[PDB]
Scaffold this active site. Structure first.
Site, PDB file in Angstrom:
ATOM      1  N   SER A   1       0.902  -1.212   0.000  1.00 16.16           N
ATOM      2  CA  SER A   1       0.000   0.000   0.000  1.00 16.16           C
ATOM      3  C   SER A   1       0.929   1.249   0.000  1.00 16.16           C
ATOM      4  O   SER A   1       1.711   1.397  -0.931  1.00 16.16           O
ATOM      5  CB  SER A   1      -0.929  -0.091   1.211  1.00 16.16           C
TER       6      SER A   1
ATOM      7  N   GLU B   1      -9.300  -4.945  -3.078  1.00 11.39           N
ATOM      8  CA  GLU B   1      -8.624  -3.788  -2.571  1.00 11.39           C
ATOM      9  C   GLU B   1      -9.551  -2.766  -1.895  1.00 11.39           C
ATOM     10  O   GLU B   1      -9.137  -2.162  -0.888  1.00 11.39           O
ATOM     11  CB  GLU B   1      -7.825  -3.109  -3.696  1.00 11.39           C
TER      12      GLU B   1
ATOM     13  N   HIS C   1      -7.089  -6.126   1.320  1.00 10.25           N
ATOM     14  CA  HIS C   1      -5.730  -5.677   1.054  1.00 10.25           C
ATOM     15  C   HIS C   1      -4.884  -5.882   2.327  1.00 10.25           C
ATOM     16  O   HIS C   1      -5.359  -5.765   3.401  1.00 10.25           O
ATOM     17  CB  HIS C   1      -5.738  -4.218   0.569  1.00 10.25           C
TER      18      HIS C   1
END
Ligand SMILES: *[C@@H]1O[C@H](CO)[C@@H](O[C@@H]2O[C@H](CO)[C@@H](O)[C@H](O)[C@H]2NC(C)=O)[C@H](O)[C@H]1NC(C)=O
Ligand SMILES: *[C@@H]1O[C@H](CO)[C@@H](O[C@@H]2O[C@H](CO)[C@@H](O)[C@H](O)[C@H]2NC(C)=O)[C@H](O)[C@H]1NC(C)=O
Ligand code: NAG
Ligand code: NAG
Lengths: 532, 532
Positions: free
Chosen positions: B197, B324, B437
């Site tokens: 990320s 995500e 995620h």
């Protein structure tokens, strides 16, 4: 005598015609207006003055003056659509097929031919009304109307070439049927108007127009609706095209009086020869002289009439063919040919998109291209060809019609929707064109019942079902037999939006006809082009 | 002694730690910068002054000051992400796990944690490097860096709070590894940086930044790229937020000197308490203090650097998780809850779209809504929930990353792309969130190898494969074993664009990862919002 009928315009004499090992009466070429010639060219039509003696109504009339398709000399696929009689500006006639023995008061169906408002004939072999008149015991009428500049040149404000006179020709004939069909055994309180492509948009226009709504009971629209993007233009664009027509013929352009006089001096073919040069864009599916939003025939914009319920409330039956765009791509988009499979390259796709949506800025063209492109397989020639087909059909016929049905159903008294997707086994056009627009017509007029035409047995059965759906809807306002055991064509409703497929397989019912694509053409794209 | 290492900054003493019935060395909490406290708050980091004596490197360091997630007190799903040590502005330390016996010159991997640049810790249980260090015989380093206003407040022009200092912290640690990892047995000419990320966007930023490219060899990016829409802001927006931060703390705002001095007088938590009030829009997936496009760390705009090849050319391995967007919708979109299936109504869908794409005008919101709506089934709650998930993930992570890989691959020396879609069997988050995620991280660090954690056998096998792909790519620049018999992860190329799924099933290779949606987010929508 059964072939002699006395009407309010005078006596008419028909002729006996054979049909499927039996016979019926035919009254061909009955005049319903004064010949619109000379000084009356471009003018509103006038009623036909009554005549003494007997009008011989045994042979087809002349077809109106029009552009003739010579793109494939001798090919039946295109020539079956061309005028099959001498052309002439003296062409306002109608044809009637009447069951034998003569009915006293039966359901009447009036056919309005398509042809993009620039062409068309009531006398085509596929429009022969004897099969439907005979099989469903209805009085079948086919009318005619001026096409091209002769029917639609518009110089709003001038009373000499006001525009919409082709629509008034259809209207006069509906008036004559209202006034005289009873003498042929027809019931004037039960007439259904039906037609295809421009004939279908015309039907929708008489549903909207205050001066036409009282002349018919019900309506059937095949692949056409009044709000189609090619079916009308503003008074200003009509005007612009009329002046450009005059400029192509070296006319004096200082006043409407001068332009109109010059245009009236020209032979018919001088007008037809330069007709296509007035289009504002390099386009596909756009015709030069079409109805104009004039404030008279159409009181306000079509969309505001649709939103407010300003239209005739009655029952309607309408639908489309699966491959509405192929004819137009064949004739005018690059990469398409009659004798190849027409696999389209990405360059040709993009060329086609620009031709299909003439009025779009670049963001708009990108929006269309993205919506119809499979990005995992963007060089698939067949996918590009079929995507272009869909773009043309959805934008020009299906989504406009879907928008009309949803707006109409809100105030109407019953809607029946179909999706015709059977390709005829004897079609001479190539396979890539699919279920070509207009090829549902032969089934509506019952050609598959005559053996020598070579359809299959299941095709004859499909024809009989469509003829009976169309004729039962005309007689009662519902295509289904009351207590039949056959499966039912459900009513289309604002909520459920049901429709049926129409083919040789067992009837299947579906919902929201091409919704995904139509929200794009009816809601998003107009919004994108207005903001940008 | 094996736990004693003499570096250029001084002597450090580690500790022996058990791992999967064996042992390795750990040097925890090694300082790599002077504490950024007091007057140095917001300032670029300075190198740590060498020390005499032995630095005790046996326990984890403090975690930097950050916002702490209290949304689900006591729920492990969220708390496993929270700081697990005392917080402090004295937090610039790194951790090293070294195989036993000490290698002489082995591959080095440096982990950069995510957390939206506002949170994150190098000491989390899921980031424990002993399993990977031990199983793949690599020296594993995890670094730390200032987050939130402490790491990213930006008043471009002032040298006291220039911005990007959090990125310079990561850079200093990469410098220290370059200069000292050889004494731990690491090969400084073979270090791979990898992170998730914001850690993945950071990795991409050091690939772009001229001052960082010479400090590492290769890179791995998990669910993040430098061009992500939440990863950077302009100098003007950075400035606007810094002034608004000051206004929330009643600071004197007449000069940068005055604002900065007031902010430096505030306790850490006074800054964290008002941090979120500076966002310009009601949004989802947007963080207050993030890197700034300053003309120094990033010489020009990211897109022009990407287009011109202005970046480090080397091999990269990167990918994303299937779902995500779910974490962000759970925490901030209406209609989503942790203990329900979160079926979304059309109203909530529309609310979500507006929150997901904050910067969009109405035409833009309509374009997004049309692209993700199934118009044949528009009130399907599950479809609306999953569509929103996709909108958030595609716009924020997948398409930005896909755009980066396509631009990078043009000048790079080898790209390997993955799509991780296995949901862990012991996940405590609800099913509707999918393959959340960050939940591929436990597999990269090898947690499924420890029995008491309760993964399945196939999960342990998937972990071993990912660890070996990541470590083999780090050592050689190719995740595949030269002559192995295992199926091959193909190179991603400008033309074929191949990628592999990553799960417990036999490897399947695909092409053009979410192309349809990404042409919409990378090409069309930006074009629509610029014209309109
Ligand atoms: C078409 O119109 C007819 C009559 O105008 C509708 O039938 C009426 O329905 C209302 C409400 O159901 C009743 O109060 C009347 O008794 C009915 N009148 C008659 C003569 O039946 C009919 O529902 C309409 N059809 C559609 C599809 O809208
Ligand atoms: C990565 O770079 C290497 C070397 O810079 C590339 O290998 C060279 O390939 C060219 C053309 O195929 C040959 O002329 C050289 O002999 C090669 N050099 C070496 C040392 O092998 C390699 O192809 C690049 N890889 C990718 C995926 O771009
Ligand atoms: C009118 O119909 C045709 C004209 O071609 C022909 O049979 C004849 O001239 C006419 N018939 C009658 C009965 O007058
Ligand atoms: C430093 O490490 C810990 C500190 O908590 C403890 O074992 C001891 O105080 C120190 N160890 C040594 C060897 O100095």
């Amino acid at each position: 005598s059964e072939l002699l009928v006395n009407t309010k315009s005078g006596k008419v004499m028909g002729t006996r015609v054979p049909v499927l090992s039996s016979h019926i009466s035919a009254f061909l070429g009955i005049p319903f207006a004064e010949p619109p010639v000379g000084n009356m060219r471009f003018r509103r039509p006038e009623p036909k003055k009554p005549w003494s003696g007997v009008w011989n109504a045994s042979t087809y009339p002349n077809n109106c003056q029009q552009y003739v398709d010579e793109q494939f000399p001798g090919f039946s696929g295109s020539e079956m659509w061309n005028p099959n009689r001498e052309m002439s500006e003296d062409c306002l006639y109608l044809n009637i097929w009447v069951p034998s023995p003569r009915p006293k008061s039966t359901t009447v169906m009036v056919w309005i031919y398509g042809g993009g408002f620039y062409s068309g004939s009531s006398t085509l072999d596929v429009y022969n009304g004897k099969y439907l008149a005979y099989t469903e015991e209805v009085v079948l009428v086919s009318l005619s109307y001026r096409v091209g500049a002769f029917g639609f040149l518009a110089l709003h404000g001038s009373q000499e070439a006001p525009g919409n006179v082709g629509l008034l020709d259809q209207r006069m004939a509906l008036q004559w049927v209202h006034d005289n069909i009873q003498f042929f055994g027809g019931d004037p309180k039960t007439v259904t108007i039906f037609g295809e492509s421009a004939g279908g948009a015309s039907v929708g226009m008489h549903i909207l127009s205050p001066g036409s709504r009282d002349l018919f009971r019900r309506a059937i629209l095949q692949s056409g609706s009044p709000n189609c993007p090619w079916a009308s233009v503003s008074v200003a664009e009509g005007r612009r095209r009329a002046v450009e027509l005059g400029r192509n013929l070296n006319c004096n352009l200082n006043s409407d009086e001068e332009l109109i006089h010059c245009l009236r001096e020209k032979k018919p073919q001088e007008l037809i020869d330069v007709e296509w040069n007035v289009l504002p864009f390099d386009s596909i599916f756009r015709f030069s002289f079409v109805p104009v939003i004039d404030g008279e025939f159409f009181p306000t914009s079509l969309e505001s009439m649709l939103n407010s319920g300003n239209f005739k409330k009655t029952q309607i039956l309408l639908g489309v063919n699966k491959d509405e765009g192929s004819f137009f791509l064949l004739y005018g988009a690059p990469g398409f040919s009659k004798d190849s499979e027409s696999k389209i390259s990405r360059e040709d796709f993009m060329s086609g998109v620009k031709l299909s949506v003439p009025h779009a800025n670049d963001l708009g063209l990108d929006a269309v291209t993205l919506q119809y492109t499979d990005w995992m397989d963007d060089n698939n020639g067949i996918k590009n060809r079929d995507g272009l087909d869909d773009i043309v059909g959805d934008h020009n016929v299906i989504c406009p019609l879907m928008h009309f049905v949803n707006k109409y159903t809100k105030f109407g008294n019953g809607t029946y929707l179909y999706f015709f997707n059977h390709r005829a086994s004897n079609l001479v056009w190539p396979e890539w064109m699919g279920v070509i627009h207009g090829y549902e017509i032969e089934f509506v007029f019952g050609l598959p019942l005559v053996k020598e035409l070579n359809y299959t047995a299941e095709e004859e059965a499909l024809s009989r079902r469509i003829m009976h759906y169309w004729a039962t809807f005309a007689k009662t306002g519902n295509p289904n037999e009351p207590h039949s055991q056959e499966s039912k064509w459900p009513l289309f409703t604002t909520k459920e939006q049901k429709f049926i497929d129409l083919n040789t397989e067992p009837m299947k019912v579906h919902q929201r006809l091409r919704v995904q694509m139509c929200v794009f053409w009816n809601q998003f794209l107009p919004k994108l082009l207005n903001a940008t």
